Amino acid sequence: RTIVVTTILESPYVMYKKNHEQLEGNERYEGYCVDLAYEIAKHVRIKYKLSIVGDGKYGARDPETKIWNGMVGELVYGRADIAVAPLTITLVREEVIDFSKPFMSLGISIMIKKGTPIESAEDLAKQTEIAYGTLDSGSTKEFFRRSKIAVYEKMWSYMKSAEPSVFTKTTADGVARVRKSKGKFAFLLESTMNEYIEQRKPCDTMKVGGNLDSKGYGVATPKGSALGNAVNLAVLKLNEQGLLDKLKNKWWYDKGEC
Amino acid sequence: RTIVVTTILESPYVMYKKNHEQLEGNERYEGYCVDLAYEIAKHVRIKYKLSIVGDGKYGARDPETKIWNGMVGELVYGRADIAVAPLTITLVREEVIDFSKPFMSLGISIMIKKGTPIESAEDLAKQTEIAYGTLDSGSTKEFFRRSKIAVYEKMWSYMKSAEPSVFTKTTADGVARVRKSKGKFAFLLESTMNEYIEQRKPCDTMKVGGNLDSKGYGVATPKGSALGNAVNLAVLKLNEQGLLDKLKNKWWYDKGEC
Numbered sequence: 001r002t003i004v005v006t007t008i009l010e011s012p013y014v015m016y017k018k019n020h021e022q023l024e025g026n027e028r029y030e031g032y033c034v035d036l037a038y039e040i041a042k043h044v045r046i047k048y049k050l051s052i053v054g055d056g057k058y059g060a061r062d063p064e065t066k067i068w069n070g071m072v073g074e075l076v077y078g079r080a081d082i083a084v085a086p087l088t089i090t091l092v093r094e095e096v097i098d099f100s101k102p103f104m105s106l107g108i109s110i111m112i113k114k115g116t117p118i119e120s121a122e123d124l125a126k127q128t129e130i131a132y133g134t135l136d137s138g139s140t141k142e143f144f145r146r147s148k149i150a151v152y153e154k155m156w157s158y159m160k161s162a163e164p165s166v167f168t169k170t171t172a173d174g175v176a177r178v179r180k181s182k183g184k185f186a187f188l189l190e191s192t193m194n195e196y197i198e199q200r201k202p203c204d205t206m207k208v209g210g211n212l213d214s215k216g217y218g219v220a221t222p223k224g225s226a227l228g229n230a231v232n233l234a235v236l237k238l239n240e241q242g243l244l245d246k247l248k249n250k251w252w253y254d255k256g257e258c
Numbered sequence: 259r260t261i262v263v264t265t266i267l268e269s270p271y272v273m274y275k276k277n278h279e280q281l282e283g284n285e286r287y288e289g290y291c292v293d294l295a296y297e298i299a300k301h302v303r304i305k306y307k308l309s310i311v312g313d314g315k316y317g318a319r320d321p322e323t324k325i326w327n328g329m330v331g332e333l334v335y336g337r338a339d340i341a342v343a344p345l346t347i348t349l350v351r352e353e354v355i356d357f358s359k360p361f362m363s364l365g366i367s368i369m370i371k372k373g374t375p376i377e378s379a380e381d382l383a384k385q386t387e388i389a390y391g392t393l394d395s396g397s398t399k400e401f402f403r404r405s406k407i408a409v410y411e412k413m414w415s416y417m418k419s420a421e422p423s424v425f426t427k428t429t430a431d432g433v434a435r436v437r438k439s440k441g442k443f444a445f446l447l448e449s450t451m452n453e454y455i456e457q458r459k460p461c462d463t464m465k466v467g468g469n470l471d472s473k474g475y476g477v478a479t480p481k482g483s484a485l486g487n488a489v490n491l492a493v494l495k496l497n498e499q500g501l502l503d504k505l506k507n508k509w510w511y512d513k514g515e516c
């Protein structure tokens with residue numbers, strides 16, 4: 001009856017509220033996806049428990065074991081009834097889980113420390129002084145691994161062969177690496193996160209160049225889940241009611257700091 | 259065996275080739291959706307025949323008869339197996355047909371003749387000298403009809419009762435009206451079409467302001483259609499393989515004229 005909603009602590013989607021340690025259950029969290037979950041749950045008429053994905057990962061199929069990790073894994077292996085998170089709709093994932101229509105559009109973007117002489121993926125690919133990386137177990141890394149576009153193939157080859165790893169285990173780590181690397185690290189991450197971070201103190205990062213691709217986050221459910229339909233309709237309704245836009249404004253721009 | 263692909267004559271998605279009268283079948287047409295259908299069909303491994311929707315409409319449900327027209331109707335009533343078209347994914351359509359994940363992201367946008375003193379929906383809403391309208395039988399019109407947001411409600415109220423009609427039967431008609439109206443007509447249409455027209459001579463129109471909303475086109479199939487799955491996976495694959503980006507460039511920007 002209480003459905004398990006897997007999600008990931010990723011600002012501003014799901015964040016601990018400042019006074020959270022005096023709260024329990026869903027009350028502890030706030031953010032775009034918390035609001036989204038609330039709104040979805042309201043329309044799908046379910047009780048739900050927000051559960052932060054144990055491994056902290058979005059989800060990436062180990063090529064050896066074929067095991068899916070992250071929230072995708074939570075869904076695939078029956079541990080969560082629905083993932084409400086900035087979980088990118090991708091082909092390999094759609095093969096194993098269902099996604100609502102996107103509740104957010106985004107693209108892979110480059111985050112640089114302000115003043116970094118990078119304006120594009122091409123700029124990154126044609127040089128080596130500025131290291132770059134992406135989130136592990138995420139759609140962005142897969143994008144590059146799988147890309148047949150020459151420049152991205154080159155970036156992938158660099159990243160894949162980067163030592164130490166230029167793959168981070170959290171977005172926060174990637175952002176931290178950008179911020180601490182005096183311009184010598186650029187982070188490839190989704191424009192949504194990039195933009196949010198760009199608006200948070202210390203305001204020392206920025207998104208550069210256009211998006212490398214265009215995709216969406218969807219609310220994910222186990223393949224064939226009967227929840228999937230209601231959730232999809234809920235997402236479409238929320239988008240059309242302008243709630244998603246309002247939420248985006250509320251969580252990205254309204255509190256903007258830069 | 260041959261699946262019927264409904265689509266609509268809407269530049270640059272589907273256009274007659276110059277020598278179309280010499281040609282038969284799919285060869286008659288060219289454009290983004292013609293290329294996309296070709297790629298989708300190749301990847302789904304189906305033979306298909308493009309069939310231009312008779313009523314030249316995207317699809318809306320007549321409140322009286324409850325009859326779906328346009329491409330949505332072609333799918334709903336079993337005359338087409340798939341719609342490959344700039345068909346907006348909407349809640350009401352999703353209730354009657356299936357959509358792939360979006361192959362294009364877009365929003366309602368304002369097309370003005372260059373020089374028109376309008377920079378936003380608010381600018382349009384708060385005034386009457388500049389008439390504005392949208393396509394009939396499309397998601398844009400429904401967006402305004404359905405909107406509970408004051409500005410758009412005001413715009414809807416304006417449009418609903420504007421005389422003569424500010425609603426056009428084709429995008430082309432709306433564009434032509436913008437172009438002919440000396441800046442006294444603005445056209446609310448999807449950013450995609452807006453951006454395309456912006457790139458075409460006489461180069462006298464432009465998209466202004468941000469998009470009013472954010473949504474996507476999906477390749478549509480009849481609810482529960484088996485084809486739906488492969489098509490969705492095809493779209494995801496083509497997206498990730500950069501096809502859609504390439505097609506967008508090919509049909510919008512590469513031949514750009516402005």
Ligand SMILES: N[C@@H](CCC(=O)O)C(=O)O
Nearest residue numbers: 058087088138139140190
């Ligand atoms: N949204 C991504 C995670 C962030 C990224 O990979 O950039 C995913 O679902 O995997």
Ligand SMILES: N[C@@H](CCC(=O)O)C(=O)O
Nearest residue numbers: 316344345346396397398
């Ligand atoms: N893409 C829209 C048509 C264009 C518009 O309504 O502005 C639809 O599917 O209805």
Ligand SMILES: [Zn+2]
Nearest residue numbers: 016020021022
């Ligand atoms: Zn705590």
Ligand SMILES: [Zn+2]
Nearest residue numbers: 274275276278
């Ligand atoms: Zn002709």
Ligand SMILES: [Zn+2]
Nearest residue numbers: 297298300301
């Ligand atoms: Zn192909």
